Amino acid sequence: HMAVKKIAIFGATGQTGLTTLAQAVQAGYEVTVLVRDSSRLPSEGPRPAHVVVGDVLQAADVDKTVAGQDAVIVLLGTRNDLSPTTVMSEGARNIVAAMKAHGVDKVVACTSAFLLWDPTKVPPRLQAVTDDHIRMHKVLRESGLKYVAVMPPHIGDQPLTGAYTVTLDGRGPSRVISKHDLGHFMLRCLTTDEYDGHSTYPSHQYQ
Amino acid sequence: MAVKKIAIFGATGQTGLTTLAQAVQAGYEVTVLVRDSSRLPSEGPRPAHVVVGDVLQAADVDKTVAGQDAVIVLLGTRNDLSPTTVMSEGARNIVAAMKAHGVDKVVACTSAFLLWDPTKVPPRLQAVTDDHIRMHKVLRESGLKYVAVMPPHIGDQPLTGAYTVTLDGRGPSRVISKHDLGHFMLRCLTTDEYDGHSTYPSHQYQ
Numbered sequence A: 001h002m003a004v005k006k007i008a009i010f011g012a013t014g015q016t017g018l019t020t021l022a023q024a025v026q027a028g029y030e031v032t033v034l035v036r037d038s039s040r041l042p043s044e045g046p047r048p049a050h051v052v053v054g055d056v057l058q059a060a061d062v063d064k065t066v067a068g069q070d071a072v073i074v075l076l077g078t079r080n081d082l083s084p085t086t087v088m089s090e091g092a093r094n095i096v097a098a099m100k101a102h103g104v105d106k107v108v109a110c111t112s113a114f115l116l117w118d119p120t121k122v123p124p125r126l127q128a129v130t131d132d133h134i135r136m137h138k139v140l141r142e143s144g145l146k147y148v149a150v151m152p153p154h155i156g157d158q159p160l161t162g163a164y165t166v167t168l169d170g171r172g173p174s175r176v177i178s179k180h181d182l183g184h185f186m187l188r189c190l191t192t193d194e195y196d197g198h199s200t201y202p203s204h205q206y207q
Numbered sequence B: 001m002a003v004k005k006i007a008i009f010g011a012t013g014q015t016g017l018t019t020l021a022q023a024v025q026a027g028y029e030v031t032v033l034v035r036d037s038s039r040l041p042s043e044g045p046r047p048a049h050v051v052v053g054d055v056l057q058a059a060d061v062d063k064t065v066a067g068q069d070a071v072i073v074l075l076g077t078r079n080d081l082s083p084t085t086v087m088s089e090g091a092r093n094i095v096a097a098m099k100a101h102g103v104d105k106v107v108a109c110t111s112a113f114l115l116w117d118p119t120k121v122p123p124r125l126q127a128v129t130d131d132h133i134r135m136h137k138v139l140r141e142s143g144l145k146y147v148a149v150m151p152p153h154i155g156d157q158p159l160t161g162a163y164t165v166t167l168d169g170r171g172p173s174r175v176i177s178k179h180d181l182g183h184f185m186l187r188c189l190t191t192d193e194y195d196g197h198s199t200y201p202s203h204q205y206q
């Protein structure tokens, strides 16, 4: 019943990844995850269909994760770490190469609403990570793949609602999206082509 | 000082390709050193002279620099993650060839990381930045008229020709379009006001 049913999730162990994984498994997706050796999925949580242990910085590991999929969700990040990094942009380069080799077209990837900002107004403490989001978005935009650029504001702990606003190619009217709603939106992007080639800013007022 | 013939190194890269196109459309007689001719586009603006070879091969560089009025350097390694000397060894070959042929003017791209604290550099870019620093030193010590171009993030925005150029420091914006960056490399051929300076081109797109 699902045009998209086998998906790879990068960053499934992270804040948004964990609830995206849980929702995807409940929705009937056959999920493959790439996890780093020292940080596997928690014993409590939902179980994906396939687990690749490795690093998004290894093309071989990314290839093993992307092979055979219908689509890719990207929720990579550096947890609390604000240091200069290229893990997201280099990871995206590997994902793009693997998708082209394996005939996968659809990629839904999370960067940041700061990419819709006047670049000079981003807080300096956040500029190093934002710089790699900028690099990652460029890699994905230039790939020619069917790319939904998800650019959220603050990721919060509020509920799953499915009632959030999706603003196309600009900043939205609220400054938060719950991690659960952000994961819900990443999965919604698999069911439609309407956001392909756009930037999307999901946001909501939790009340 | 009027420049008609230029060599471009790195013409097949993202900045090189648009610099080449703009140079050809503006009337420059352009010589490129390319390792593979098939990487030059089949259509549109074509360079006047194509030397097939390697910036690591001194004979190939000498052949490219001979008879030019100025040199544009847009070399890069793209994927090197660990110590690498391709750019600095290329620049040594370029300097020796410019000296042997009486070519005075070189406009060379490194990166704005040379204007930031070293702790700003992502670990996997430290090797390429180290070699940018080595290449910059090679060019500054050469005695040639050298404009050091140190761009921030290189984007894909359309050509504007309206960017700002900050001298010997960082400017307000943190992006430059590859087209604007190539525009600025060519602007450096028409003036000596940037010689011996570091230049930081940047703009706000929109």
Ligand SMILES: NC(=O)c1ccc[n+]([C@@H]2O[C@H](COP(=O)([O-])OP(=O)(O)OC[C@H]3O[C@@H](n4cnc5c(N)ncnc54)[C@H](OP(=O)(O)O)[C@@H]3O)[C@@H](O)[C@H]2O)c1
Pocket (backbone or CB within 6 Å): A010, A011, A012, A013, A014, A015, A016, A017, A034, A035, A036, A039, A054, A055, A056, A057, A075, A076, A077, A078, A079, A080, A087, A088, A110, A111, A112, A113, A129, A152, A153, A154, A155, A156
């Ligand atoms: N927090 C906010 O308010 C906010 C707002 C806007 C945008 N963002 C951006 O949204 C994105 C998702 O944020 P989040 O909080 O959900 O993510 P997160 O909690 O930081 O999780 C990052 C994910 O990436 C994985 N990862 C990191 N490096 C990896 C590597 N080399 N190889 C394989 N996997 C790797 C992590 O695995 P490990 O378990 O092994 O660490 C983890 O699963 C981030 O890019 C973030 O910057 C956040």
Ligand SMILES: NC(=O)c1ccc[n+]([C@@H]2O[C@H](COP(=O)([O-])OP(=O)(O)OC[C@H]3O[C@@H](n4cnc5c(N)ncnc54)[C@H](OP(=O)(O)O)[C@@H]3O)[C@@H](O)[C@H]2O)c1
Pocket (backbone or CB within 6 Å): B009, B010, B011, B012, B013, B014, B015, B016, B033, B034, B035, B036, B039, B053, B054, B055, B056, B074, B075, B076, B077, B078, B086, B109, B110, B111, B112, B128, B151, B152, B153, B154, B155
């Ligand atoms: N991307 C950014 O945002 C950014 C920011 C700051 C600074 N920079 C720096 O700006 C400079 C230009 O960047 P770019 O992205 O436009 O360059 P690029 O797309 O990576 O192209 C590099 C050029 O150098 C050539 N090259 C590499 N090794 C060579 C060799 N041995 N012999 C002859 N040619 C060789 C390449 O030829 P082939 O086609 O044969 O490979 C290519 O034409 C780089 O040094 C880069 O580090 C980039």
Ligand SMILES: O=C(O)c1cc2ccccc2c(Cc2c(O)c(C(=O)O)cc3ccccc23)c1O
Pocket (backbone or CB within 6 Å): A112, A113, A114, A123, A152, A153, A154, A155, A171, A172, A174, A175, A176
């Ligand atoms: O708690 C924080 O550290 C926090 C700090 C901020 C600093 C400046 C502007 C917005 C901030 C937001 C809300 C927010 C926004 O409002 C917007 C926007 O309106 O485009 C985009 C954002 C993108 C990423 C993260 C937050 C975003 C935060 O939560």
Ligand SMILES: O=C(O)c1cc2ccccc2c(Cc2c(O)c(C(=O)O)cc3ccccc23)c1O
Pocket (backbone or CB within 6 Å): A086, A089, A090, A091, A093, A131, A135, A138, A139, B014, B111, B113, B125, B128, B129, B152, B153, B154
């Ligand atoms: O813009 C930046 O701040 C930036 C700064 C750099 C400074 C020194 C050397 C390379 C840099 C690249 C190269 C680069 C990369 O490093 C990556 C990556 O890390 O995946 C992807 C690229 C995609 C297209 C073109 C260049 C790419 C940048 O981009």
